[PDB]
Write a protein that binds this ligand. Structure first.
Ligand SMILES: Cc1ccc(C(=O)O)c(N)c1
Ligand SMILES: Cc1ccc(C(=O)O)c(N)c1
Lengths: 340, 344
């Protein structure tokens, strides 16, 4: 195997042979790929259009170089809440907090902005750069933790530099959600693009995860309140693609602009406001996505069906805000950081 | 204008806005493009599929960075004989031979290339020709011999950043088209061979915008030359319009040949094949060389005449044959080698 062969096959617009994406990612993670090869590969795979099998090899190779959390310290039922990345408020970060406040372990995964989720969390007082043991204590003691991507994926630094140098979105942009070092088996995963969402869903299905890959039919990388969303429901090795409509649960149609963010600070303030009871479109979307994650989580253990699960989901997410549990959980998480 | 803007547009399978490819190429030529950026651009332009306007921007910016040939030193009617290479076939240097034959028929020839089995430049050196010369001397060679060679790394030094990336990734890209389009002597006619029929119509397009008289040719068996093994596709560029054609050498009495009968080797081998043909040896190689020489002569005729196709090929083929059988072609190679040896 070699770059000219792998690159050639991609520009000839052919799917790779089994193991070629893996070999390419390995070269990249070991510092043996030149930046030009890295770039050529990311672009060529983006424009050929990666298959689920190919993306699975990239993510699995990436994980095999990651720092793990200490074994037997992430619950069997932890969930991730995360988009692939419209200058909006950090709906995922808020949802994550709400999900944790409703009783469900959450472990998120991220970096400082490409206000990114990580920046907002820092702007809220949360310590984002913790090692595996403290991330694990965060889970046990607060019910949520955050894995800072560069501490857990140090070998990804060559690819990271190339991604900044070229700017453009590529296949690499899919790996965040698939390389959460805590390896939760459940999640709600937001995707800007419908074609790539199906691929993403294929990768999760081969992991036997219980996940909802979500794409707003307005292009939002979360469940939206402005229109329908497409959900790829993933469980027990298979995919149930469907059209989801939140009007069915009584959510008013909102405007895309009503969900708009700003600096880390603006987004921190939006979080403090929603968690403190402010009604509105932002809350509506936060609750919608929190319920989504709660439903995914239910996929791991419960036999419960789609609609009843969505209903429990919504009531739990609502109640976690209204009872102050979310606001209280955030304060507890902050405390935890300061008590080293 | 930026890399995110330009690359994002290409990955979305869109043609670029005017000026974008030129900005890119400018960054690349001035040292300001990071290797990753050069690679990303090359690959994305390839997979999107470039337009003639995009490639004309790349080429024109590259030319603006080249060393000049001195004024009034290139005849109004010089021709190039050149292929994109990369056919993957490893044949004898058919272009180098045709170029010698063409110059021997009285058509001034100005080639342009690099080293690579064995490239045009490498074979030229194996024959004793000095390929590494400054523009004064290339101009002088043209005037005193009837042919010159522009060594690409000497005329396009600023292309060095692009050339390193090309080597690191090793895969054919849009940059593989630029050689024929950045000949520093700016011949207005040529016979341009293309490995890939897709990009040939694009290549024809750029020459058409230049108002050149060019035959862009592709062997229907994958050769970047006119072929004797089967038919060829030709894009005739004249008066600013392209025109696609199927050409069949059997219509001038050429036997079908076998691809391995045109097989190359190291610089010593290809040099011995040149010697044999120029010396009068008959066979598939000679045939191939005469065919492609005539094509270049037909392209040259297109400059100062609107002569008919079949007679143009008939004069073309008789002048190439004669050029060899009179000994002119052999003599001209000797003249070229002697000229280099006088430089001191
Ligand atoms: C996921 C990720 C993102 C960025 C870097 C980095 O080094 O900048 C990294 N090492 C890992
Ligand atoms: C056309 C060309 C090819 C290669 C190089 C190089 O620097 O190696 C160059 N400077 C110009």
């Amino acid at each position: 195997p070699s770059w000219p062969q792998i690159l050639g096959r991609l520009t000839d617009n052919r799917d790779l042979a089994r193991g070629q994406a893996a070999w390419a990612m390995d070269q990249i993670m070991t510092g043996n790929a030149r930046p030009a090869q890295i770039a050529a590969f990311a672009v060529a795979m983006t424009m050929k259009a990666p298959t689920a099998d190919e993306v699975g090899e990239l993510a699995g190779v990436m994980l095999s170089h990651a720092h793990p959390l200490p074994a037997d310290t992430v619950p069997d039922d932890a969930v991730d809440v995360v988009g692939t990345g419209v200058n909006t408020v950090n709906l995922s970060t808020m949802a994550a907090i709400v999900v944790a406040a409703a009783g469900v372990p959450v472990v998120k995964h991220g970096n400082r902005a490409a206000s990114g989720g990580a920046d907002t969390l820092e702007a809220l007082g949360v310590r984002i750069d913790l090692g595996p043991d403290l991330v694990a204590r965060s889970l046990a003691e607060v019910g949520i933790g955050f894995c800072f991507a560069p501490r857990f994926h140090p070998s990804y630094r060559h690819a990271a530099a190339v991604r900044r140098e070229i700017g453009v979105p590529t296949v690499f942009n899919l790996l965040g959600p698939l390389t959460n070092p805590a390896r939760p088996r459940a999640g709600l995963i937001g995707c800007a693009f419908a074609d790539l969402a199906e691929v993403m869903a294929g990768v999760f299905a081969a992991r036997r995860s219980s996940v909802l890959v979500v794409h707003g039919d307005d292009g939002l990388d979360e469940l939206t309140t402005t229109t329908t969303s497409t959900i790829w429901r993933v469980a027990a090795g298979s995919v149930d693609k469907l059209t989801f409509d939140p009007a069915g649960f009584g959510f008013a149609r909102a405007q895309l602009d009503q969900l708009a963010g700003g600096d880390a600070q603006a987004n921190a303030a939006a979080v403090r406001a929603v968690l403190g009871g402010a009604r509105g479109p932002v809350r509506d979307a936060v609750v919608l996505n929190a319920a989504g994650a709660i439903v995914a989580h239910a996929g791991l253990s419960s036999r419960a069906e789609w609609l009843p699960a969505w209903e429990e989901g919504l009531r739990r997410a609502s109640a976690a805000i209204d009872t102050g549990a979310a606001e209280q959980l955030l304060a507890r998480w902050v405390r935890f950081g300061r008590q080293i």
